[PDB]
Design a protein around this ligand. Structure first.
Ligand code: JF0
Ligand code: NA
Ligand code: NA
Ligand code: NA
Ligand code: NA
Lengths: 245, 297, 58, 242, 242, 58, 58
C-alpha cells in the first residue's frame, strides 16, 4: 500500500510491487513557468503527451566490483524521441523529471545502491595526479549522453566532495532485501526561468553501490540496473533550425 | 475558444508550484515532553526504512523515559546572515617597486573570491546564492607599515576599458565608481548590490558558456558562467611618477541580506584552482581521522 | 525612510529589521532575520507521509 | 559644527561589525528574483538531514575508501560478541567527520541537543538477527562486555521488513551546552560511547552470504542548536589557489 | 561633546557618493529657467528613436564612408540568394555602433528588451520585390540558405507605396538581462543573427536602374531598459586636449 | 526645512526627494528623480498621428 | 529599540536603564542598577528568627 505503485504519464505506464514510496525533490512538484518569472516574450510550445512520457534509455550491469555511474539531465534525452527534437529546434528549454531506477534480484542476493540527484554536478579531474597540471574533463565526460559514465573515484564523486554527504540531495536507496526501485520527482532547478538543453545540464543522476552486491555461486549473476525517466511540464521557446550542440 | 474535453480539463500551464512543506517559526530548540513506558504492539517508532530517502522521525520521548525540559536555547546564530556576514579575506593585490608582477604602479584583479579556502568552502555549501556585500580595502607596505600614499580603486564592469597603465585615460573615471583614499586613512569600505543578470550567483555551473564543438582546447571553458563574472578591480598609486613605496592591498568581503538554495556536500579535498573542483588524484585523503580497528577507540 | 528598494532580499518570506542612511537599501545593515525553518523540505521530502508509530513500509 | 568627541574603537575595522557603508551604484536595481527550489533559511535545517557516518574509519588507501561507508556483521559463536564502537562526540575527530552534521558543527564553538543514528541492514532478505546498540553516558568506560553495555541507554534491533532502526543519543549533559570535546581537559564535554553487540546471532540459510553490511546514517534531533560561530579546524589549501 | 566613533570609509572619496557639501555662494539665486523645447528626462527616450544602422560597414577610405549608410539589392537569378547579414548584438562591435542606441548602450553593463530594425527601400517607384528577413536566436549558426533561415523569426517584405518594413528582434534570452556580448565566454549573451534573402527577385521594367539601395534604421522597443552604469569603451582623445 | 530655493531644478515637472543641512538648496543631494518619460517628443513628432494597423501613407 | 536580548543580565530581579546603538544588547552601557539589598541572606540565615529585645537562646 506503499510498496505497490503505478506511474502513468503519456502513453507509458510503470508498475512495481516492491517500492519504497516516492521522493519529491526539495518538496515541490514541477510547474510551468509563470508570467512574472518569465522574461522571453515569444509564446512557448508545450507538446504535452508527446514529450512528457517515460523513456527507458540505458542498462548497466551491477557487479561485485562496480564503482558507480552518473548521467546528466537533460543531456541523456537530447537525441531521443519528440523531446530531443524540440530540445534541438529550440534555444530555450525547461522541464521537470520523474526518474525511475530499476534493479531486481532475489531474496538471496544483497546489496544497496544509493540513487540521488545532484544539481549543477560539475565534474573535476585528478589534475595530473600530483595536482600541478590544470587538466579539464572532456565533453564526453561532462555530457556522457545516454550511456552515462563510470565514476573514477566515487568516494569524492570525481569532484572533490564526499559521497557520504550526498544524502543531503533528493535520494532513495535500492536495498535488495527491501525494494527493487527508486522513484524521484524533480522540479526545474536553475537561477534562470529557461535555459539551453544543450549547453547546460541542470542536474546529475548518481547510482552508486555503497554496500557491494553479493550472492552465492549458482544464483543468477547478471543483475541489471535500468534507467527510465519522464520529462514533466516541458516548455520550449526561441525556435529556429535544429542544432545538436 | 476551446471545445474538446481533453483541452478544457488539461493542467497544461499551471504556474502554481504545489509545495509539500511549509516553514514554521522556530526561535528556540524544541522542548522535551514527559514520557513513560509503552509496551505496545503495532506501535514501532524505533523501526525505520531509510530506503525511502527520509530521515528518522523517532524522537527522544518515544525511545526512553524523558522528563520535561523547557529549551530556551536560541537558533539565531545559525541563520544564513549570521553565518556569512563576517568579513573574510578574498583577494590580495601586490604593487611592488622592483618586481616581476606589477612594477608599473597599477594592477587589475578579476573579481573572483575563490582563491581563498576559508571563504570558498563556506559559500560552496550552497549551489545558488543571492546577496549584497560590504567590501573593505586594507592597504599597507609588506611590513605592515603605513605610509603617506594616495591610491585610487576603480570598479571596471565588463565592457568598460581596463587601465593599461598608471597613466591610462580610463582613470578619468567619469562613469565607473572610484574611491580615492590614503594609506594613512582607515580602510576604505563600500556597499555592493547583487549585480548578476541571473536571479542568483552560482558556485557551480555544469555546462558550457557557448554553443559549438567542445574540443580539447576549449575545455578551459567548461563550468564558466558569465553571470558570475562581475568585472575587474583596478588600483593605482595616484601619480605620473612611480611611487616611492611597495604596497599590498588586502580585500575583505562581508556578505549581507543573503539567500541560498540547494545545499551540497562540503569540500573534503584541498582546493587547487579557482575555476574548478579539480583535486590531487594521488592524494585523495579520507574526510577525517582514522583508527586501527573498528572495535577500539 | 523613503528609499529605493534595491536590497538583494527585497520580497523575501522572512522580513528584516535594518538601519540605513543612504537612498539605496542595499547599503543597509544585515539586521535581524526571521526565525522560520522548513527541515522537511530536505529531511522528509516524501509524497505520502508515514507516521512515527506505524512501520514505514505498509 | 556640532560638538562631538571621538571614543576608543574609532577607525578600527571589526570584521563582524554590522554597519552601514556607502553604495557604489546609486539607483541600481538588481535582477528580480525568480522562484528557485530548495531555499534554506537556517543551518539547523541541514543538521536534521541524515548523512553517512564512517564508523568503519580504518581503511586509508584510495582504492578502499568506499569501505569506510559501511561495517559488517556475520554469523558468530553466540557469545554476545562486540561488533563495533565509536564515540558519540559529533564535533570530535573520528566517524562523525564524514557527516554534514559534523562538518557544520565545526563552524560553531558550542552545541546542545540530542543526536540520532539510524542503522540500515543491507544483508539478504533471508538473513535475520538481533543486535544490541548501547549509548554509554559520560564516565562509563568502554563496556568490556555486552552485560555492562546493557546497563546504559540502548535499543535491541530485530532484522525484518523494516531495514533500519534508530538509536537516539539523548542529551545527557551537566552543562546546557558542550564545547567540542578532545583529549585533555576538554574531554569534560565528551558525549559518551556507542557500542554494538550481537544480541542473538546473524542467522542465514543455505545459499545466502555469511557476511552482510550495515550502513549508519546520523543527524540531529529537533532540540539541537549551536552557538558561538567560529572558523572550522580545516583549511583546504596548501599554497596559493591559482 | 557628543560621543562618536569613526567607522571605516572615513575620509574616503567615492565618486558616486551622493552627499551634501557646503555651498560656496550663500543666498545666491540662479537665473530663472525659461521654457526650452525638447527636454529629455530619461535616456530610454532616446533609445526609442531610430538612427541609421551601418549594415554595410566595409568601406573605410574617407571618400567612401557615406556608402556604409546603405546596402544594395539588384536583379538576381532567382535562387533565393543571400543579400546581407549581421549580428543583432546591440552593444557589440559592428553595425550597431553607428546607432545612438548602440552608443548609449556603451554606458551600461547590462541591457534587456526587444529591438527593432526598419528597412526603407529607396529604389525607383517602378521597382518591385519581396525579401525575407530573418532573426536567428542564439545557437543557430549563420543560415547556409534561405530554407534554413526561414525556420526562425522572420518577415516577408513586399515593396510598394509603403517604402519600409519593420523586423522586430523580440527578446528571447535565458537571462533577464544580457551583458555586452563579445568573442569568448561572453558570447553567452549573444542576441543572434539577422539575415536578408531574396524571396522573389528585384524586378524592374525597361528604363529604370538595375540597382537600388536599402537604408536600415534601428531602435529599441518599449520594454527595453539598461542597468549598471559604466564608462564607454572609447575615449576620444590621444594626447591632452588644448 | 526653511531654506532658500536656489536649486537648479526649482520648479521642475519632476519632483525630487533630497537631503540637506545648509540654508541653500543647491547644497542638497541629487536624490531620486521622478520616472516620467515622453518618447514621442522625439520618436513620433508628427502632426496628424498614424495608427499601427493602418498604412502610414493614406 | 528592537534589538536582541543577549545581555548577561536579561531577566534580573533588578532592572537597568541603559544606552545602545547596536542590535545586540550586551553592547549597551552598564547604566544604573536598582538599589535593592538582602543582608539577611548572609547576616541572619536562621530558620526560627529571634527578636532583638528577647534573649537569643530561649
Ligand atoms: C568602488 C569599488 C572599487 C573597487 C572595487 C569595487 C567592487 C568590487 C567587487 C564587487 O563585486 C563583488 C562580487 C562578489 C561576488 C563575486 N562572485 C559572484 C560569483 N562568484 C563566483 C566565483 C567563481 N565561480 C563562480 C562564481 C564570485 O566570485 C563590487 C564592487 C568597488
Ligand atoms: Na566652527
Ligand atoms: Na562606507
Ligand atoms: Na569634552
Ligand atoms: Na562639503
Amino acid at each position: 500500500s506503499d510498496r505497490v505503485a503505478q506511474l502513468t504519464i503519456g502513453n507509458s505506464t510503470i508498475t512495481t510491487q516492491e517500492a519504497a514510496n516516492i521522493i519529491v525533490g526539495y518538496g515541490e512538484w514541477p510547474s510551468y513557468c509563470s508570467d512574472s518569472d518569465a522574461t522571453a516574450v515569444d509564446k512557448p510550445t508545450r507538446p504535452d503527451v508527446s514529450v512528457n512520457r517515460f523513456y527507458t534509455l540505458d542498462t548497466k550491469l551491477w557487479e561485485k566490483s562496480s564503482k558507480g555511474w552518473y548521467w546528466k539531465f537533460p543531456d541523456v534525452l537530447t537525441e531521443t524521441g519528440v523531446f530531443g527534437q524540440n530540445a534541438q529546434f529550440h534555444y530555450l528549454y525547461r522541464s521537470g523529471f520523474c526518474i525511475h531506477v530499476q534493479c531486481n534480484a532475489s531474496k538471496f542476493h544483497q546489496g544497496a545502491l544509493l540513487v540521488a540527484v545532484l544539481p549543477e554536478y560539475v565534474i573535476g579531474t585528478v589534475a595530473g595526479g600530483t595536482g600541478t597540471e590544470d587538466t579539464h574533463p572532456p565533453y564526453k565526460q561532462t555530457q556522457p549522453g545516454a550511456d552515462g559514465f563510470e565514476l573514477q573515484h566515487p568516494y569524492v564523486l570525481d569532484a572533490g566532495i564526499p559521497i557520504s554527504q550526498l544524502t543531503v540531495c533528493p535520494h532513495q536507496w535500492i536495498n535488495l532485501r527491501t525494494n527493487n526501485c527508486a522513484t524521484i520527482i524533480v522540479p526545474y532547478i536553475n537561477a534562470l526561468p529557461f535555459d539551453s538543453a544543450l549547453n547546460h545540464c541542470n542536474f546529475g543522476l548518481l547510482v552508486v553501490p555503497i554496500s557491494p552486491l553479493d550472492y552465492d555461486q549458482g544464483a543468477t549473476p547478471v543483475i541489471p540496473i535500468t534507467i527510465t525517466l519522464a520529462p514533466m511540464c516541458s516548455e520550449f521557446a526561441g525556435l529556429r533550425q535544429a542544432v545538436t550542440q | 475558444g476551446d471545445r474538446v474535453a481533453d483541452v478544457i480539463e488539461s493542467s497544461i500551464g499551471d504556474s502554481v508550484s504545489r509545495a509539500l512543506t511549509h516553514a514554521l517559526p522556530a526561535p528556540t530548540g524544541q522542548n522535551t515532553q514527559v514520557s513513560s513506558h509503552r509496551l505496545d504492539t503495532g506501535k514501532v517508532p524505533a523501526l525505520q526504512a531509510a530506503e525511502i530517502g527520509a530521515s528518522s522521525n523517532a524522537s527522544d520521548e518515544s525511545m526512553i523515559e524523558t522528563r520535561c525540559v523547557l529549551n530556551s536555547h536560541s537558533t539565531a546564530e545559525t541563520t544564513l546572515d549570521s553565518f556569512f556576514s563576517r568579513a573574510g579575506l578574498v583577494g590580495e593585490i601586490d604593487l611592488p617597486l622592483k618586481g616581476t608582477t606589477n612594477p608599473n604602479g597599477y594592477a587589475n584583479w578579476d573579481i573572483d573570491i575563490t582563491g581563498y579556502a576559508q571563504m570558498r568552502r563556506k559559500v560552496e555549501l550552497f549551489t545558488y546564492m543571492r546577496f549584497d556585500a560590504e567590501f573593505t580595502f586594507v592597504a599597507c607596505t609588506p611590513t605592515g607599515e603605513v605610509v603617506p600614499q594616495l591610491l585610487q580603486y576603480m570598479f571596471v564592469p565588463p565592457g568598460a576599458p581596463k587601465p593599461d597603465s598608471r597613466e591610462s585615460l580610463a582613470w578619468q573615471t567619469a562613469t565607473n565608481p572610484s574611491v580615492f583614499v590614503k594609506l594613512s586613512d582607515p580602510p576604505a569600505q563600500v556597499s555592493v548590490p547583487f549585480m548578476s543578470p541571473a536571479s542568483a550567483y552560482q558556485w557551480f555551473y555544469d555546462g558550457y558558456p557557448t554553443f559549438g564543438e567542445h574540443k580539447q582546447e576549449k575545455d578551459l571553458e567548461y563550468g564558466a558562467c558569465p553571470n558570475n563574472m562581475m568585472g575587474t578591480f583596478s588600483v593605482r598609486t595616484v601619480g605620473t611618477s612611480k611611487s616611492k613605496y611597495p604596497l599590498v592591498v588586502r580585500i575583505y568581503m562581508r556578505m549581507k541580506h543573503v539567500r541560498a538554495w540547494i545545499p551540497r556536500p562540503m569540500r573534503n579535498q584541498n582546493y587547487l584552482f579557482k575555476a574548478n573542483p579539480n583535486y590531487a588524484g594521488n592524494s585523495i585523503k579520507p574526510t577525517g581521522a582514522s583508527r586501527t580497528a573498528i572495535t577500539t577507540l | 525612510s523613503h528609499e529605493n528598494s534595491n536590497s538583494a532580499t527585497e520580497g523575501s518570506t522572512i522580513n528584516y529589521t535594518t538601519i540605513n542612511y543612504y537612498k539605496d537599501s542595499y547599503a543597509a545593515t544585515a539586521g535581524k532575520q526571521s526565525l522560520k525553518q522548513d527541515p522537511d523540505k530536505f529531511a522528509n521530502p516524501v509524497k505520502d507521509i508515514f507516521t512515527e508509530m506505524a512501520a514505514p513500509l505498509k | 559644527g556640532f560638538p562631538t568627541e571621538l571614543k576608543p574603537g574609532t577607525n578600527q575595522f571589526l570584521t563582524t561589525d554590522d554597519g552601514v557603508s556607502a553604495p557604489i551604484l546609486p539607483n541600481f536595481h538588481p535582477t528580480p528574483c525568480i522562484h528557485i527550489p530548495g531555499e534554506v533559511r537556517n543551518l539547523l535545517e541541514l543538521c536534521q538531514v541524515e548523512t553517512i557516518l564512517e564508523v568503519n574509519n580504518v581503511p586509508t588507501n584510495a582504492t578502499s575508501l568506499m569501505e569506510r561507508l559501511r561495517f559488517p556483521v556475520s554469523a558468530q559463536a553466540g557469545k554476545g560478541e562486540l561488533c563495533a564502537v565509536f564515540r558519540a562526540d559529533p564535533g570530535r575527530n573520528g566517524p562523525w567527520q564524514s557527516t554534514l552534521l559534523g562538518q557544520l558543527c565545526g563552524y560553531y564553538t558550542q552545541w546542545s541537543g540530542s543526536l540520532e543514528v539510524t542503522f540500515m541492514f543491507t544483508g539478504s532478505f533471508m538473513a535475520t538477527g538481533k543486535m544490541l546498540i548501547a549509548y554509554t553516558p559520560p564516565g562509563g568506560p568502554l563496556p568490556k562486555d555486552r552485560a555492562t553495555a546493557m546497563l546504559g541507554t540502548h535499543v535491541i534491533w530485530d532484522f525484518g521488513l523494516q531495514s533500519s532502526v534508530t538509536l537516539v543519543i539523548p542529551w545527557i549533559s551537566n552543562t546546557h551546552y558542550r564545547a567540542h570535546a578532545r583529549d585533555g581537559v576538554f574531554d569534560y564535554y565528551t558525549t559518551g560511547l556507542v557500542s554494538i553487540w550481537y544480541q542473538t546471532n546473524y542467522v542465514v540459510p543455505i545459499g545466502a552470504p555469511n557476511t552482510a553490511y550495515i550502513i549508519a546514517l546520523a543527524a540531529a534531533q529537533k532540540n539541537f542548536t549551536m552557538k558561538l560561530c567560529k572558523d572550522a579546524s580545516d583549511i583546504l589549501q596548501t599554497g596559493t589557489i591559482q
